[PDB]
Structures are given as C-alpha cells and as structure tokens.
Amino acid sequence: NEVGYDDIGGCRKQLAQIREMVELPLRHPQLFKSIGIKPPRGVLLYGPPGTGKTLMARAVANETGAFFFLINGPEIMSKMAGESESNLRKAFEEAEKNSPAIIFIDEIDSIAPKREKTNGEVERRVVSQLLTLMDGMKARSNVVVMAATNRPNSIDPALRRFGRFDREVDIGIPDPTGRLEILQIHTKNMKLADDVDLEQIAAETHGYVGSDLAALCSEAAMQQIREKMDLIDLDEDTIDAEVLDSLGVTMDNFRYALGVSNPSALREVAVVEVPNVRWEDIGGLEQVKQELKEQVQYPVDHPEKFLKFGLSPSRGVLFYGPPGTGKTMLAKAVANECAANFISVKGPELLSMWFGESESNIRDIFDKARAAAPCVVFLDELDSIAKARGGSIGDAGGASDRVVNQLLTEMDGMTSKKNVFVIGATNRPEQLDPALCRPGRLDQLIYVPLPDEAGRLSILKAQLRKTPVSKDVDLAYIASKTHGFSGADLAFITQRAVKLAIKESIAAEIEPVPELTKRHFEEAMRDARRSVSDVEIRRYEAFAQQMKNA
C-alpha cells in the first residue's frame, strides 16, 4: 500500500520529468540556489482517468525523505462551509513548518472548477482560498505543490497561469511495451500458470489504461475460480488448500478476459499514439512515398539546412484522391518511420465532440502535439467537415462552418519553428474551401492514384503477409485481371476469399485447409466488382492535371 518507483511502470519519460521537478529541488535545493533560479512550485498532473495519476504521486512522495501531505478533492468539498477552507490553511502551515514538503492534491478540479461555470459561492471561496494560499508560499519554504486531474480543461485557468501552476505534465496512454511492464506489476503478486504470455496479451491490448489492465488481471483470476467452483462448496466455511495450490490462472482465462466487458476501454478522446504500419505494408505509390520523405521527413530529421538556407518549410500537406486508396495508413507509416508522435483525428470526431462542445481539446490537439513534438496531426475524413453542412453543395452551406473557423485559427496559431506537423486527407478535394487550402495552412496537395498491376501486385504481396496462402497463387495473374480495382477492393476480395475458404473450412468441419486456393480465388475473381468509376477518376485526373485553378 506504500508505493515505490518499481510499483509504477511504463511512463518512464513522465517520471523523468517529475524527478527533475520534485525529487530534484528537494534533495538538492542548492542546485537552484547555485544556479540562481526559482524552483518550480507548480507541478500539475493530468491525463485520462484511471491512469496511475494518484499512483504516481506516492511513487514520488514515498521515494523522498521529504514530508508529505495529502489532499483529496471531494474530501474538502464534503466539508461544511468555512471549515473546508480552514483545512487548506491547516494544510500549508504544516508544510511550511516541515519545510521539505510535498503537497499532493488529487482531483483538483472538484475544488477548482471554472469560476465562470459554477454556482455556489462556497465553491468560489475555496477556489479563492486556493489562489490566495498558492501565492502565500515562499521559495525559502521549499515546498512543492502537486495536483492531478482527469479534466485539465475544467480547471479555473488562473491556477494554470504563472507562479501557481506552470508544469503541465500529461500522462499518456502507454505503448504495448510499457503496458507489458504494467501487466508484470500486477501479475507478480498473482499466482499464474506457465502458459501465461503477457507479451501475447500486451500485443493484443492496444488502448487500455492500467486500470483496464488491473481489471483485466482481476477478471481472468475470477474465471480461473469459476473453473474451480465445481470443486468449491460455498456452504463450507473454509475451502481446502489443495484447490488453492491448483488455483493457477491460465492463458485462456485471459483469452476469456479479453473478450469480456473489461476490454471496453477509454479510447473516445483525442489520443496520441505511435503507429504500427510501415512502408512495406503499403504497396506501390513510391513516388508520393518519397514526396513524404521530402516534405515531412526532411524537417523532422534536419532543421539544420533550413537555418542554413533561411527558409521555413511548408507545414501543410493535403492528401487527396479517390476513396479507398489507403490514405489513412499513409500518415501512420511515415510517423512510424521518423518515430514522430501521431494523432489521428477523423471528421465526425470533431463534430461529435462538438455536440458535447470539446473545442479546447481541439486546441489541445495542437497543444499536446506541441507537448509531444515531434508529432504529426492527421485529419482524416475532411469531407465530413464539408458534410457537417452536407458538402460544398450540401444544405447550401459549404465546407465552412464553426469547425473550419476554429481550425483556420489553430492552424495559423502554430509557430513555423515548431516541427509539429499537420496532415490533411480527403477523398472529395473539390468539395473543400480554398481558405483551408491557403498557403501557410495547407499548400502541399498530394494526389493518391490507383495502383497499377505492379502496385496491385505489391499490395497483394503486402496484404497477404500474414495469411497462409496457397502455393499455386499467381498474384500477377490476379494482378492481370484486377485492373480498375482499388487497394480496398483487393483486400475486399481476400475477405470474400477467406470467407469462401471458411465456406470450405468449417463447411468441412461440419461435413483444416490453411491454404487460399485458386478455387477460393476464381470464385471471388468471378465475383470481383469494381468500386470506382473511371469517370470519377477523370474528375480526379483533371484535378491531378490541375487543381491549382481551384
């Protein structure tokens, strides 16, 4: 119940920050005294809910030799009027007494909402009590104030101003590497069986917080007990120890526990996440591959030539082309190359968060990408922004609405020195306003054509990298016959053909064929159907000839 550094894992970069911010001024205040700067007393934690934010507090606090004081958000708000503000005054006097001191406040937004958006003056006093007492502190006190929340936007920003809270520290969703470590934290207390592959689990878990993983560990434990319920009689007052020794959680319990309701995660926000697709997994289009190698990889790798040449680059890249051409995966593979952070934002994600009005988060998309620089910001489904008013034809309203007017501010509100990059992608590029296509905003426009038969060969090579295909498969004879078919169409054929294979596989199981026959294919090849009209392409090829007329 007392937390060390080993009890938390995965968010190493974040803990590297806090040790510089909290561990460093306390065990060595002389360093800031020798260099002659002020120690930051404004450490702020934030992130998604249930992400160890309370856990990382004591992970730092118990690893000091400093005094610690604890404040809960609702504990002060539970108290009566006046007495609640007394405890804050009782808090800081003890911390300024025991001068090496740590003040952590969990759920800071409950005692500090926006003063504009609040009703009770008792809430307004305790905010005003907090704003007063933060400034009443001293640098000679050597007392560090920590605060955590899950809603960094609901806070009164006067705290987030200078002198009170300056150190915005986000706790992001961990990678499969770091969440593997988190599983090892919870399972090292657990009693498992030898079949348990956490690395298989951590690969199969993608958007989970540690609370989801701890519930995941707690869930598969229960199913292990459910298997033993036949051997366990509940009318007994104590079960025997032999079933306790056999109580070892199987890998299949986690396979059970991956398909249950725990696995509903918290992924419905504006997330930053490193991608997984690469250049080999996208067949063909090597010209625009190198164009991204030109336009976005050269700044993130070498800003030195720019200051050599005195020229800031174009930060605005627009993808366009026919639909179903893998334009979503393109920005993921290039962020996976130069290891930049990645933020996927779709069209209705703007709108559905604006039926709930999350537009500071839209600014925070740029801010977190500024916080996670180098980062690329990917705007999927830009036609949906036009389809917020139906289209450019639409309900007579064009692409421009409150979304565009927000984005044009935030795209122009980006420093050109920043390597934070914005990637736009649509399939209906005529149906977007040129105000967003304005130079400085989005001036690079990249057409994504259909592949040729060599590209369609390279896709079918790349798509079937994980499939047990047959040996007689002439993909080139497929690539000969597939001409007008998109890369989405080719994957759609394989989804048909695998379904045709399962119409042989479990059909034989009810009557292992791990091979995808020509008979599986020539049925789907006869059933093959083109999804893109060539007269639609003649539009895009005229745009590929010239869209700069606009």
E strand or H helix that includes residue 446:
strand 444-447
Stretch of 79-87, 172-180, 194-202, 272-280 contacting its own copies, by CB under 8 A: 79-87
Is 426 among the annotated ligand-binding positions?
no
Burial class (CB in 10 A: 0-12, 13-18, 19+), 473: middle
- Are residues 349 and 391 in contact, defined by beta-carbon separation less than 8 angstroms? no
- Partner that binds at residue 487, options ligand AGS, Mg ion, its own copies, none, CB closer than 5 to 8 Å by kind: ligand AGS
For the CB of residue 117, give the shortest distance to ligand AGS in the complex, in Å: 19
Using rule CB under 5 A, residue 99 touches Mg ion: no
Q: Which of 114, 267, 518, 539 binds its own copies (CB under 8 A)?
A: 267
For the CB of residue 422, give the shortest distance to ligand AGS in the complex, in Å: 17
Using rule CB under 8 A, residue 121 touches its own copies: yes
Binding mask 381-420 for its own copies (x = CB under 8 A): x-xx--xxxxx--xxxxx-x-x-xxx-xx--xx-x-xxx-
d(CA 435, CA 398): 12
E strand or H helix that includes residue 453:
helix 453-463
Is 106 among the annotated ligand-binding positions?
yes
- Are residues 352 and 324 in contact, defined by beta-carbon separation less than 8 angstroms? no
Long-range own/partner contacts, residues 129-132 (CB < 8 A, 24 or more apart): 129/85, 129/88, 129/89, 130/88, 130/159, 131/156, 131/158, 131/159, 131/164
For the CB of residue 82, give the shortest distance to ligand AGS in the complex, in Å: 26
Q: Which is nearer to its own copies, 98 or 409 (CB)?
A: 409
Using rule CB under 8 A, residue 471 touches its own copies: no
**Max CA separation in the chain (angstroms):** 83
Q: What is the DSSP letter of 435?
A: T
Is 212 among the annotated ligand-binding positions?
no
Using rule CB under 8 A, residue 200 touches its own copies: no
Binding mask 512-541 for its own copies (x = CB under 8 A): x-x--------------xxx-x--x-----
Using rule CB under 8 A, residue 226 touches its own copies: yes
Stretch of 121-129, 182-190, 267-275, 328-336 contacting Mg ion, by CB under 5 A: 328-336
Stretch of 274-282, 334-342, 472-480, 498-506 contacting its own copies, by CB under 8 A: 498-506
End-to-end CA distance of the chain: 64
Q: Which is nearer to ligand AGS, 41 or 53 (CB)?
A: 53
E strand or H helix that includes residue 91:
helix 83-97
- Partner that binds at residue 419, options Mg ion, ligand AGS, its own copies, none, CB closer than 5 to 8 Å by kind: its own copies
For the CB of residue 211, give the shortest distance to ligand AGS in the complex, in Å: 4
Q: Which is nearer to its own copies, 430 or 454 (CB)?
A: 430
Residues in region 40-79 near Mg ion by CB under 5 A: 54
For the CB of residue 161, give the shortest distance to its own copies in the complex, in Å: 5
Using rule CB under 8 A, residue 107 touches its own copies: yes
- # chain residues binding Mg ion, by CB under 5 A: 3
- Are residues 297 and 334 in contact, defined by beta-carbon separation less than 8 angstroms? yes
d(CA 468, CA 478): 17
For the CB of residue 20, give the shortest distance to ligand AGS in the complex, in Å: 20
Residues in region 198-227 near Mg ion by CB under 5 A: none
Q: Which of 2, 242, 311, 471 binds its own copies (CB under 8 A)?
A: 311
Q: What share of the chain is helix, strand, coil (3-state, %, to 5)?
A: 50, 10, 40
Q: Which is nearer to its own copies, 136 or 454 (CB)?
A: 136
d(CA 426, CA 381): 5
E-state strands within 240-366: 316-320, 341-345
- # chain residues binding its own copies, by CB under 8 A: 161
Q: Which of 62, 328, 463, 505 binds Mg ion (CB under 5 A)?
A: 328
d(CA 15, CA 8): 9
For the CB of residue 392, give the shortest distance to Mg ion in the complex, in Å: 19
The DSSP-derived string for 329-383 is HHHHHHHHHTT-EEEEE-HHHHHHHHHTT--HHHHHHHHHHHHT-SEEEEE--HH
d(CA 518, CA 529): 17
For the CB of residue 150, give the shortest distance to its own copies in the complex, in Å: 8
d(CA 291, CA 289): 5
**Residue pointed to by tokens 């130069």:** 338
Residue ranges binding ligand AGS (CB under 6 A): 8, 10, 49-55, 107, 148, 150, 161-163, 182, 185, 209-211, 214, 282-284, 323-329, 427, 438-439, 451, 459, 486-488, 491
- Are residues 422 and 440 in contact, defined by beta-carbon separation less than 8 angstroms? no
Is 328 among the annotated ligand-binding positions?
yes
What is the binding site for Mg ion (CB under 5 A)? Answer: 54, 106, 328
Residues of each annotated binding site for Mg(2+): 54, 106, 328, 380
Please enumerate, by residue number, every residue annotated as part of a binding site: 54, 106, 328, 380
